[PDB]
A paper describes a structure:
Mutations in the LRRK2 gene, which encodes the leucine-rich repeat kinase 2 (LRRK2) protein, are among the most frequent genetic causes of late-onset PD and account for ~5% of familial and ~1% of sporadic cases. Most LRRK2-related PD mutations, such as G2019S (Gly2019→Ser), have increased kinase activity. Previous studies have suggested an emerging “Rab29–LRRK2–Rabs” cascade for LRRK2 signaling, in which GTP-bound Rab29 (Rab29•GTP) facilitates LRRK2 membrane recruitment and activation, then activated LRRK2 phosphorylates Rab GTPases, including Rab29 itself.
We determined cryo–electron microscopy (cryo-EM) structures of the Rab29–LRRK2 complex, reconstituted by mixing LRRK2, Rab29EM, GTP analog (GppNHp), adenosine triphosphate (ATP), and Mg2+. We thus introduced three point mutations (Q67L, T71A, and S72A) to Rab29 (Rab29EM) to maximize the opportunity of capturing the active Rab29•GTP–LRRK2 complex (where Q is glutamine, L is leucine, T is threonine, A is alanine, and S is serine). T71A and S72A prevent Rab29 phosphorylation, and Q67L abolishes GTPase activity and enhances the interaction between Rab29 and LRRK2 (26). The observation of LRRK2 dimers both in the presence and absence of Rab29 suggests that COR-B–mediated dimerization of LRRK2 could occur under physiological settings.
Residue numbers in the entry:
A (entry chain C): 12 to 101, 113 to 167, 172 to 175, 177, 179 to 181, 183 to 207, 209 to 325, 344 to 513, ...
B (entry chain A): 5 to 176
Write the structure that this text describes.
């Protein structure tokens, strides 16, 4: 048992004959891969088992045997020994990159090296060492790419920090390389996932959108992947959706493609409504693209937004994006004003919107978006007037603007909402005393901003005009 | 014998006086009216032999929510409760506002927060009636002493909830 393993590791330290050491390493690798016990993981974790092997492989590069089986042996050891990654750090990256550099031109030698690199990069804190080497790891992996086992899809983590100029260089060269990968490996779900999220990672710089939209290749490929490759895959749809969200800009007038992606977005939010995975990205993307497109679907959007608020109350971002989408939809489509409300067959989204505002007072963005949404809703349908007033909206937002004063956008949205709320209604002296001083103080605190002043003046205008004695005070 | 003060707060038109009339004046349902100012009620409970407790229920008018909730009402108070109608999430947000206000402007001799109970007013009304799963989020998040559904008109659970709350209050 362990005595034979001790003899093998002792003989491994001799480094006498390359062929004999190769056979011993092969026998040790064959014996180690078993489910009998953790004898191979005897807690020693001695580098003397594998450091001389990699030294011999690097120095004697012509020895293909140690290259072929030493990588498999270390892969099996890492997959078996739990603290092997802990033994890696606290180097080996230099050794593996030299292995990939000098003599890994064979398919068999390359695949094991890329697999070992992929499993090593799942540990963390070693990527910095990999990116600060001298072997040009990005050039190595680019030179690596028609094999089905595309282990180079582990290039993922390398995009986490690449800098803008090198990112543009990767955009060009790696896009030229990766289009072939996605075309020849269309029937590989994991490969499609990795390629799509690598596109996500490289799409961070703003200047590269024009490069990505050189011939609408990005839009077409992502739409085709969403349509065909993944009818019922959550990860693919989520990644493609995040690409859709990050690829919205001044060039949004991709009219036909607009319509296409819009449909796909609907499909996405209708087929996986359980996590932020799709909801936030699609709703923000959808809101902008719906504005552009509109210049049925609206009912589906209302339903999707209602479940988005309902099922993700704990996340600020989801509710913000969803209520913003509801606002942007209602702005361009007013026919559904009666389609929403407390009555049966209509989504009670007004209470959900109010809830969003109250449950995230600490954030100005949620207040801004939800306030604009319910202000547009109140302006659309007159029936909702005096209902939210009876529900506690006026004094509540007054206290909220008292809490949030450092920004002008929040004050402007609040004043606009008061204007569209209090229109066509008559208040009492108590409401006057509870409204006028607070809005006057808010207007004083933000005197320079023109929209805030306009909305405040409009609100005061719509709101200003025994009983005589009280009114005099 | 002992005396105590309980302050009932909540949104407007939530039948704030309905519950206090039901528990003390034995008046339930009735017409829905607006409470202009703070009103008072007395309750006497024979909790134990030779131990009779008196309760002063102050039903704070929620119309002036934007107005500064003066600490004089909560001054010398021994207990409080927030009761909101179940047909509006705005009553729920208002209850959050009341909870924040009382946490900011209420003190006890031991310094610990006084017991608070979440009353789900008028559950005998469609459609948002038994949504206890949504209520549980704030029930465990706000750290309230208790939470209990109720119906002022039917008086289905006013007595048990009030007994639980007062037992918790004397437990301190």
């Amino acid at each position: 048992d362990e005595e034979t393993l001790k003899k093998l590791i002792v003989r491994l330290n001799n480094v006498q004959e390359g062929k004999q050491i190769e056979t011993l390493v092969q026998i040790l690798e064959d014996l180690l891969v078993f489910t009998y016990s953790e004898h191979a993981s005897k807690l020693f974790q001695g580098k003397n088992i594998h450091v001389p092997l990699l030294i011999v492989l690097d120095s004697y590069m012509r020895v293909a045997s140690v290259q072929q089986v030493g990588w498999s042996l270390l892969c099996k050891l890492i997959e078996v020994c739990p603290g092997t990654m802990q033994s890696l750090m606290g180097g080996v990256h230099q050794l593996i990159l030299k292995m990939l550099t000098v003599h890994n031109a064979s398919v068999n030698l390359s695949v094991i090296g890329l697999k070992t690199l992929d499993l090593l990069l799942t540990s963390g804190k070693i990527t910095l060492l990999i990116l600060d080497e001298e072997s040009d790891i990005f050039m190595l992996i680019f030179d690596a790419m028609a094999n089905d086992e595309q282990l180079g899809c582990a290039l993922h983590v390398l995009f986490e920090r690449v800098s803008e100029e090198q990112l543009t260089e990767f955009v060009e060269n790696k896009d030229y390389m990766i289009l072939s990968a996605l075309t020849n490996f269309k029937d590989e779900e994991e490969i499609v996932l990795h390629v799509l999220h690598c596109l996500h990672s490289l799409a961070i710089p703003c200047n590269n959108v024009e490069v990505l939209m050189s011939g609408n290749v990005r839009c077409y490929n992502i739409v085709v992947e969403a349509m065909k490759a993944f009818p019922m895959s959550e990860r693919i749809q989520e990644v493609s959706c995040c690409l859709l969200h990050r690829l919205t800009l001044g060039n949004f007038f991709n009219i036909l493609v607009l319509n296409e992606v819009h449909e796909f977005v609907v499909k996405a939010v209708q087929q996986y409504p359980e996590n932020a995975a799709l909801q936030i990205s699609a709703l923000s993307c959808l809101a902008l693209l719906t504005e552009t497109i509109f210049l049925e679907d609206k009912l589906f959007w209302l339903e999707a937004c209602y479940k988005a608020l309902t099922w993700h109350r704990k996340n600020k971002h989801v509710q913000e994006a969803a209520c913003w989408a509801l606002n942007n939809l209602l702005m361009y489509q007013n026919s559904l004003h009666e389609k929403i409300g407390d009555e049966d067959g209509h989504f009670p989204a007004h209470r959900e919107v109010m809830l969003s505002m109250l449950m995230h007072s600490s954030s100005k963005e949620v207040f801004q978006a939800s306030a604009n949404a319910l202000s547009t809703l109140l302006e659309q349908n007159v029936n909702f007037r005096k209902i939210l007033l009876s529900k506690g909206i006026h004094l509540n937002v007054l206290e909220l603007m008292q809490k949030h004063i450092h920004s002008p956008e929040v004050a402007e949205s609040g004043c606009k909402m008061l204007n569209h709320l209090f229109e066509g209604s008559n208040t009492s002296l108590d409401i006057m005393a509870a409204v006028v001083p607070k809005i006057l103080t808010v207007m004083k605190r933000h005197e320079t901003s023109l929209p805030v002043q306009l909305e405040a003046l409009r609100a005061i205008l719509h709101f200003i005009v025994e009983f005589h004695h009280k009114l005099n005070m | 014998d002992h005396l105590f003060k309980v302050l009932v707060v909540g949104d407007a038109a939530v039948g704030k006086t309905s519950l206090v009339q039901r528990y003390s004046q034995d008046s339930f349902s009735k017409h829905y009216k607006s409470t202009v100012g703070v009103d008072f009620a007395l309750k006497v409970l024979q909790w134990s032999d030779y131990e009779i407790v008196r309760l002063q229920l102050w039903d704070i008018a929620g119309l002036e929510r934007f107005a500064a909730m003066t600490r004089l009402y909560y001054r010398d108070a021994s207990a409080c409760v927030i009761m909101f109608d179940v047909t509006n999430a705005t009553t729920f947000s208002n209850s959050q506002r009341w909870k924040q206000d009382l946490d900011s402007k209420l003190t006890l001799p031991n310094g610990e927060p006084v017991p608070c109970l979440l009353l789900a007013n008028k559950c005998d009304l469609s459609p948002w009636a038994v949504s206890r799963d949504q209520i549980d989020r704030f029930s465990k998040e706000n750290g309230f002493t208790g939470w209990t559904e109720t119906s002022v008109k039917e008086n289905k659970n006013i007595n048990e909830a009030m007994r639980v709350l007062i037992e918790k209050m004397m437990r301190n």
